Amino acid sequence: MSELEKAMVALIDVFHQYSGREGDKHKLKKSELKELINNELSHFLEEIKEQEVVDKVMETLDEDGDGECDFQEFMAFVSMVTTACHEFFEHE
Amino acid sequence: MSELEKAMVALIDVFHQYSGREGDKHKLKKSELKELINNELSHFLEEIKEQEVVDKVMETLDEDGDGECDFQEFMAFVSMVTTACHEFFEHE
Ligand SMILES: [Ca+2]
């Protein structure tokens, strides 16, 4: 079928199962965010080393500076990866 | 590997190949937008009937009202589907 239908389900599905690991299922905590980047998304970003890097990066995706990242803020991070990544992904 | 890596590649990959159908590879035209919804995304939206519906909907994702939808605007539509869709996708 349409690839977007599978990606839309996978994007939402991963958030529900991944965020459901802790008793917090309706919001994402600061510690969980570090784990998400450490999982295997280091390909887009490889500057993780000191805790200050996560804090500096966390402020960038924070739009209302609420101190926490909800599902709406998580979508903003996805936009950051597409805009930051180059379109030279065409040929290897 | 991480599901997000496959989805990030599929989201960008589909845009390059799908938008490359017409000589316009750097921007999306109004007619192409109707085809995208008509493809098989009618699941999220099933109110397509008169051309006015597309125009009313097109204005909603338009942020700068430039009269055309670029790659940045396309991302906004994805956010609209996630916010509009309910989270009751858990159990069938
Ligand atoms: Ca959580």
Ligand SMILES: [Ca+2]
């Ligand atoms: Ca925030």
Ligand SMILES: [Ca+2]
């Ligand atoms: Ca195009």
Ligand SMILES: [Ca+2]
């Ligand atoms: Ca526009």
